[PDB]
């Protein structure tokens, strides 16, 4: 016995630690933050999820079955008008200029990690593109459940927003369908093959925390 | 002076003309095609639109714009949610069962010509993306809009539904979407890459043709 | 191994009486036996010319997909032996009957052209590296078996001008060629799921069917 | 031409910069004056090995990408040269160090190998040919320059164990191949506009920065 979604989650782990505990992101928790920190966070984090959208198109392409080439173009969606939830509720709570957004430049830690998600993505199946773009909510969903207690996290004026985003029952939901997805998809994969997948996992979990990295570094 | 839109219609003329008075064609119009035929069409048109939904996907991975990038996922969801107008009709309307669906070989025709776009897609740009899907939307609403007098073409109990489709202010919405993405994407192209443009359109235009005969042959 | 299903000889058992079909067509006939008149056998091998430029990217999409330096060089040889044993085959013919230089980079592929290959790269670009050994198989393949069937007329190998495309594919070379490919596809596939190998099936026989309607067009020249 | 602006011109001089911290790097100057520990360079050369392995494949996606016989034909021997040159450069090095041919499909490639070699991927996939011809040219470009700058010190060349890498990079055919890719990139550019340039030219700083980087890591070794 062994879950593909559980072996990977182990492997995760300890870098999931170190993201719960960083600057930034406890920064969020006890509203200890700087908005300028934070300002230049939401602004790369949307740039992150407009090529994020990208690899769960790959996922329509790549999904070879209509329930799951349906979810995948649901989740595009949700990406681009749940941001109008999360996103667009700083961008005017701050004060993000229409123009500002779109004159913005990717960091390279940006960059690195959508274009490594994207590659593997193409380079191999539909269980690549799954197993990529998993840590991303998985990590998120972790992070904000954690924050989830000082308490007062979820009352504070400004934070209290995003930390109530990925907390929620949907983006739990979302989650869900994903980690149910690879496992479905895996059952049947060598051990091999399982290698290279849990590579993927931890190797976007290492881009995750130099995300936060990059973002405190503002 | 040519807009290129107008010049690939130009060049299409010939191809579409065969195709409304095709006998498949004309048979919706008059009511005068049998139920097997297009019931085998309805089943393969499914198929069709499964992979055609992955070229619109392919126009979100290759868009760089958040504008276009996110037209194309909604032609995503609209041709996976509108079906669930013309598609969806016919299939409880004749009766086809959930299982018989994806069931469903596609025949050579069918794949070759959603292989063509997708194929001609991945090794262009976005341009030949939006070149590509082209023929199709356009096709089917000139094909529409001539059925349009008969009368009693749209009056028919059975085919009149198909006909009022694919001549409502939405379908047209979205083919014009298409022709204006297509004459912005290349008002600086050289005379070159024009012509290759234009061999995909007329490629597509073929298929088209192909496509109606072969539902015919049914 | 060996009281194991191999997915090789069930591909190829599903494709047996399409390329029945192949052996006896007019065209293939007409190359065994020197029946078939220049002409059409010029269209041809214009057309092939043309197939083998877009048959090389679907080995290049091996590449990409290759995550193994051995297979992802194996790849890189083909797309070279594509590239430059053709300088065997197709230069033999294109000199011996004689395509002018600019006629080559003049011709259209055909519908049937076209469709065979957008096929094969679509396949590729949308699956795994399994997918890719498995569309460009039918065609090496399904040459070899024709070759090799076409081989006992005889005089078939003596013929002048047809005989050295006879000699090509049935070639010690092209075999091996044939061999690394089922091996490849052998040895991914040797943990995939029934569903997986059908689809696999359905892309080999898929190819198999272009193969046939591609010797039709060529005979229709 | 030439009153009329080039875009590989143009991308040199954004680039100019970076390359010049690259040719003062710790690394490379170590290289240029004997200076370097063998420890660093073997790290570098198994960890370039994996890169230019993935650095293979995005010249495959340029077979696919490019339409045309003649483009389509260099990029495939660029993926020979990458393939059975390093035939000259790594191999030298693994043996001349002592790389376990176990050792080497034992390593892992680093965040910043990876994120480069990633991010030239999936640019040209997501592109047309003309992001592929700018995404692998700082590469080819980069090392051009660092060669011809460290082949003055001088000894420079003479050194026993250094020598041979510039004496490499700044030969005349890896010259030939860097000019290849200039020109390439020029003849696919002439009739875009502003901002496809600059989207090409945010191309070939990046990959410059991840030239940077790469250095770094290899000194960081």
Known sequence: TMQVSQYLYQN????????????FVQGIGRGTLERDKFRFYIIQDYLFLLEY??????????????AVMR??????????????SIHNHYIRELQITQKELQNACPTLANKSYTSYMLAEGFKGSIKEVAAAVLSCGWSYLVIAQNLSQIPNALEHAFYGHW???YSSKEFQACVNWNINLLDSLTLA??????????????????????????????
């Open 12 to 23: 995760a782990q300890s870098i999931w630690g170190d993201c719960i505990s960083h600057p």
């Open 53 to 66: 959208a990208k690899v769960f198109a790959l996922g329509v392409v790549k999904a070879c079955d209509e």
């Open 71 to 84: 979810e995948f173009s649901n989740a595009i969606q949700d990406i681009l008008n749940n941001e109008m």
């Open 163 to 165: 930390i109530k985003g």
């Open 189 to 218: 994969s060598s051990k091999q093959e399982i290698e290279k997948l849990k590579e993927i996992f931890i190797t976007t979990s290492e881009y995750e925390y130099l995300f936060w990295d990059m973002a405190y570094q503002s």
